[PDB]
Amino acid sequence: MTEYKLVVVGADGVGKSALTIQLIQNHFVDEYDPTIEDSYRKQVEIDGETCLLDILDTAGMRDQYMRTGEGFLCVFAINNTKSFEDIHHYREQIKRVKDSEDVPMVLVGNKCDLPSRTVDTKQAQDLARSYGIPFIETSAKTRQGVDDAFYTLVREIRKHK
Ligand SMILES: Nc1nc2c(ncn2[C@@H]2O[C@H](COP(=O)(O)OP(=O)(O)O)[C@@H](O)[C@H]2O)c(=O)[nH]1
Ligand SMILES: [Mg+2]
């Protein structure tokens, strides 16, 4: 069984904890302590491979998962322009950690269940294209794109190493 070290990053309130918990416990938490940072393990089969996902949910230890973490989930909320503006910082932070523009990464638009997006799907694709990374729209309330995001990241790690 292979271990995949997965780091979820992004501005506070985007649903980092919600996306993590939905994957692990299969339920939507409406209020998880914004300061709680932890790793959460789950056995998953992705493409006939049994995987141990080691998922650091950054909140603000980190150094290890940033340094030794294999794939990064870059999450903004579609109803939160600032969190999408902040995405540059996190991409930069990762590049700087691993001294490379070739780090497995997925850009994540979360809260796609909410109406009246301020961040267009095209804006987000435009960014991801510019990074050479996938873009996935997710909802931790609906489970929309939730496996897709984590699994695409795993496949990125595999397509990298
Ligand atoms: N409707 C909806 N609310 C969400 C979603 N993801 C997170 N939330 C809510 O957004 C708030 C902040 O989420 P949280 O996971 O604590 O954010 P974090 O700071 O990124 O870890 C909470 O009230 C969550 O229930 C989502 O996909 N849909
Ligand atoms: Mg959190």
Curated annotation (Swiss-Prot):
Q: Which GO terms describe its cellular component?
A: cytoplasm; cytoplasmic side of plasma membrane; cytosol; endoplasmic reticulum membrane; focal adhesion; Golgi membrane; membrane; mitochondrial outer membrane
- What would be the name of the gene that encodes this protein? KRAS
| Reported effect, A140V | In OES; somatic mutation
Principal cellular location given in the protein's record: membrane
Pfam families linked to this entry: Ras
Task: Specify the protein's topology with respect to the membrane.
Answer: Lipid-anchor
The entry's keywords: Acetylation, Cardiomyopathy, Cell membrane, Cytoplasm, Deafness, Disease variant, Ectodermal dysplasia, Glycoprotein, GTP-binding, Hydrolase, Intellectual disability, Isopeptide bond, Lipoprotein, Membrane, Methylation, Nucleotide-binding, Palmitate, Prenylation, Proto-oncogene, Ubl conjugation
Q: What is its EC number?
A: 3.6.5.2
PTM comment for this protein?
Acetylation at Lys-98 prevents interaction with guanine nucleotide exchange factors (GEFs). Lysine-depalmitoylation by SIRT2 promotes its localization to endomembranes in endocytic pathways.
Location relative to the cell = Cell membrane; Endomembrane system; Cytoplasm, Cytosol
N6-acetyllysine carried by residues: K98
- Function of the molecule: Ras proteins bind GDP/GTP and possess intrinsic GTPase activity. Plays an important role in the regulation of cell proliferation. Plays a role in promoting oncogenic events by inducing transcriptional silencing of tumor suppressor genes (TSGs) in colorectal cancer (CRC) cells in a ZNF304-dependent manner.
Q: Which reactions fall under this protein's catalytic activity?
A: GTP + H2O = GDP + phosphate + H(+)
Q: What happens when you mutate K111N?
A: In colorectal cancer samples; somatic mutation
Q: What is this protein called?
A: GTPase KRas
